[model samples]
Target: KWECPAGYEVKEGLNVDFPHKGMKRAFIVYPAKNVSGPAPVWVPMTGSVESTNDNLTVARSGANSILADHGYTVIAPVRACANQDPNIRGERCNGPGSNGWNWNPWFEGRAADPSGEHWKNDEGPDSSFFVAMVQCVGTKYKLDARRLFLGGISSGGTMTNRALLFRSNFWAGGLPISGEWYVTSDDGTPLSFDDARAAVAAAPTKIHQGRVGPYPLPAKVGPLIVMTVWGGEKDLWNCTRPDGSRFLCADYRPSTQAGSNFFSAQPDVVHVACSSTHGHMWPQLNTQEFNRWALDTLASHPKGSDPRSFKLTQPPEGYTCHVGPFTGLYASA
Candidate 1:
């Protein structure tokens, strides 16, 4: 039985370790106390920009309680090499890329380690980690298979995009905030990494929308819904080097908007676009207010919902969200 330590919102018997990955790889689940069996599940991954502790990410998110209030369960997972702790921030500290999840190929259904090069398979460790996760969570608690969701901040959001493209069958929808897109042209095909780098750096518009990723998987996808958000005009990943120099990671506008275009073009996707001036942070400004609106937006839609007839209880007075593509594009070019 996996148990959360004190001071964490993650509930009992909900801690899970991957049976697939060796060496005690695990994820944290905060089961709702009020909710009964088979409730909807939300997998919220953390970005490398914030604290490395996945537990802290969910605990401090302030979304869990709101989710619990609505009869939803929350599970927080991390990629391999995601770091043992955040206190190793001294000389031992490495960056998010060097030691975090292999968002590049692993999330995209290929990889560089554990058999470096030429394995364009979606069954990699991370993908299976999620797959195995769904299975393990079920043995302990009843997971609502019809309403499972994936979401996150920056890198975690980017991974959500990849999962929907390659593993669409696993999730009902996702909420990607300031996610990244690596397509090279408007043809909707992901190109070489260098080409993608040039694309986002050069053009932050519809020119690089990968309507159907050049992924290893087929183009056709099942019904899905996503809350696409741009973290405002200054949506840049705030970074500081060991030497204290600020390194501006790529602005998130290009990827976020293009993602809206890509999903909107999908035949079965209800792409809801929303935004705020938070600038690359998760509900950093409004906190509870934002979570209440956004999480409800997702919970309202179960798997296989019709995008054409999509509607909802209107957003709060302060919220700037809307259904359909580009309806709520933010901090535009």
Candidate 2:
């Protein structure tokens, strides 16, 4: 028995640490208020950019509260290792090839530390985390089985795109901000360390839009409604060339283009883009826009329709575009 903020009741259990998505800890914030039969649950996975499991400190936290106020039970989890507190050598701390999450192939050859690899995998290991998360959340909350939503930032955002390609059943639509659109394994075999790193570096052109094979399990999955967000044209922090030069552009439309093309090719996928000077910033307005996308837009186009046709679009207004600790703001000193 736990208490909720004003007007919100304990519709379900207070805090949950359930086994799911190929992991052991997928923490959730279940709502007590507004359990009108079946509510749609929203999943906000923080980017591997932060080694901690707290999106609450980032701009994404604004969206979480907005969704809750709008009467939806929001959920988030420690989706794999961005790194650990007082992080060890190769995982989270700033390193040569490190980008927060343990995708740095350079570390893979460090065969001496098998446990480092294992620690990263434990947080959020691929699509399994989503599967585990949804099932776990669904059981406890009165979730609308078919109406699920997902979104993330940076590396987490990239992982969200990968999840849509594979775990379509777990979500109805996705909101991926500041993320690349495709992922691939260079090895002919299943994904390995080398193959994963190669794919990350090359940034391949993989299509996310398409029909799932005739298999009943994959086919049963719902379609995706993607709303992407990026920084201003002049903001070229990570925008780089092969030799690591700023790939200058007035707008980062390629990210949007990739999502758009993927959605257009598929039966029911829609993509939209939002930009602002806030480089890699996720403010309350951005969160609200995504809320509007997931609720107003997708709600209208049920039955796997192209919801992108309708958008309550705008740059994030009525919100402060502040970038706090990108990851684990409060947890750290």
Candidate 3:
């Protein structure tokens, strides 16, 4: 049996926590009123690096407001370590270097804790939590799987990419804003940008093995429709070395574009978007546009639609763009 607390009555201005795995995970739900029957649901994960769940609590209000205005049930999850509640924050806190889900292989390392334990093997804990949460909420409400969507920003965007890539079966669409399909080591050392680039290049053509957390899964999966990866031209991380020379941020727009390119090649992705003037933030219109596509798709289509057509929509200022079915959102260097 599942139940939402009094404050979280599936309507406006509601925030509450539901019990999960002995922990009360917090989430705020924005209910819909426009469309008939059960409303569609959109789940957004917050970026917890250099940020806190308290920040997420504040940021989600903006996104949920937009989602609620459009008649979509919006739910945002607070990351483990970043919780604002001082009592439970320490207990649920994911130790440093963890990004909720363990999808970044390049950065996977042994923990500094006792016995130098390695991090958890896979996305089991994070994904399972989401699954439980969704099941709990969906059972109590009328949220349908077909209308379910997932998205995030920064590290949350990283997790979003992981969900769509590794857990494609669980999401109908994904919006990975300012996120990369690949990430470098957390030690601030460049593992091998060349290798990362090579992996991206090979991903579109063949199903190669890429290390994910504790498993070697295909670098690319089959078709995943309704995916839109948004990155900005100015979105970059300048990792300057001690000598003042720099290793380019491994998860910048170039890499993000490459990842989007690979997804465009897949038979299931329908659209991808980018901006020449933005950085590390979700574009308001672009987010709404993606939501429209996702909601419309959920309303009109069935699951397992093998879609290959790709479209890139963005303002045509300060950007040199090329269009290709295979290259997708290719930007001229």
lDDT of 1 by residue, 78-147 (tens): 4444433322212222243322233431243232233323333343455556756665666567777778
Residue 8, model 2: lDDT of: 27
Rank by lDDT (best first): 1, 3, 2
- Give all TM-scores, in the order shown: 0.77, 0.60, 0.66
lDDT of 3 by residue, 207-273 (tens): 3222222233334464454344444545655444458686665445445554455565665555444
Candidate 1: segments with Cα more than 4 A from true spot: 1-17, 21-23, 52-66, 83-123, 185-218, 238-242, 327-333
Top candidate on TM-score is: 1
Count of backbone collisions within predicted model 1: 0
lDDT for model 2, on a 0 to 1 scale? 0.45
- Give per-residue CA lDDT, model 2, range 1-333, as digits (tens): 122222222224223334433333434464525567877666765543443234643344444545666666676655333221311222432222332223331121111123333322222254555555566555556776566777766554655655665656556776666654322222112233344334433442433221111111132235666555565543232434457576432122344344444554555555554454556645344566755544544444443665445444333463222111121111222
**Local accuracy by lDDT, each model:** 0.60, 0.45, 0.49
lDDT of 2 at 112: 17
Number of the top lDDT candidate: 1
Query: Which pairs clash (backbone N, Cα, C closer than 3 Å) in model 2?
Result: 9-32, 9-33, 10-32, 11-32, 21-128, 21-129, 21-132, 80-123, 80-124
Residue 174: error of model 1 in Å?
A: 0.6
RMSD of candidate 3 to true structure, Å? 6.7
